[PDB]
Design a protein around this ligand. Sequence first.
Ligand SMILES: O=C(c1ccc(C(F)(F)F)cc1)[C@H]1CNC[C@@H]1c1ccc2c(=O)[nH]cnc2c1
Lengths: 341, 20
Amino acid sequence: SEQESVKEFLAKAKEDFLKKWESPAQNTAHLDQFERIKTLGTGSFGRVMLVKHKETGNHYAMKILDKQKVVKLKQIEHTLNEKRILQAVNFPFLVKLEFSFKDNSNLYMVMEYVPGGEMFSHLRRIGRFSEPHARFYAAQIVLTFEYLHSLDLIYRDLKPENLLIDQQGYIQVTDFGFAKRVKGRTWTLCGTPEYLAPEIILSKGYNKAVDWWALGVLIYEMAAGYPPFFADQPIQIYEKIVSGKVRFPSHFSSDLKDLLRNLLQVDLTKRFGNLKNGVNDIKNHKWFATTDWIAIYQRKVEAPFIPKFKGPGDTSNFDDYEEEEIRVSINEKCGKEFSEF
Amino acid sequence: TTYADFIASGRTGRRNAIHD
Ligand SMILES: O=C(c1ccc(C(F)(F)F)cc1)[C@H]1CNC[C@@H]1c1ccc2c(=O)[nH]cnc2c1
């Protein structure tokens, strides 16, 4: 009957989600309310900076998107999806959007700042995580995808660069730029090459099963220290992905390999997360037998490691990036395209 | 070793999103 408690939880969560989805928060702060401190990461049309909110003194991570660059890259609807979905969701392993607003030049999303840095950084430095360590993070992704999928959302960009570690050692999922609310199938080609499911590559319609394939790639990369399909150029990576061959380090436990064979499954009628039992084939797999799902959700499980915290506003868990001054044009750019933002 | 092959490849830094 654990199954019925889950359904009840998800039912109320959908209620909450839909209210906000149908009536999105909009224009809830202004640039001059924040002191910009330092860039925490970048992307093709913007950057995320640490900022301090002047009226409260709280730090946040502010994503600043250049409207013109969004348009030139044809990401207008994806950016509208991002903001509309993020303002509507609520889960312990999802970064919160606290304010959003826009000006003549830019869009702005002010989110919680997660000072522990990216999983990417920690994983590359340590080499790989032990199985218990990877399982702890993996479990949080499983619960987060169960949450998001129940709301008809596909996430579509899972990777260590887009998972942050918070002060308690838990995961915060960021980067909703490709997230989409869709019943049935969708066709956009998007994600990150190492993580794309075969059906995205082969230009088929696809669905939330692509996020379960991506979890297979993530667990493999956490536990091996490299991904299951890598090469020097994306086309070589795609050929590996669609080949239907995968090999596992000799140190992977046989339960880990069995779980990954079922997630990294090219045949959709057989991919875990995608069968009649849904996420339950994953939650009940042997590799997760030690996992107490509720304890994980409640953040009662002791984390594998706690990031060094030097203080509020410290960024030493993040790489340094070149800074650039924000310029706000005296003319409104792209007003119609971003009207509902 | 596969690890050594990964470490010597040009895709151990942060990987950019792609799209059409
Ligand atoms: O810096 C980022 C970033 C920067 C620019 C874009 C853009 F392409 F502009 F849309 C997209 C993402 C992300 C990429 N992965 C992590 C990075 C990041 C780094 C820190 C935080 C944070 O502290 N809170 C919320 N999101 C965060 C996101």
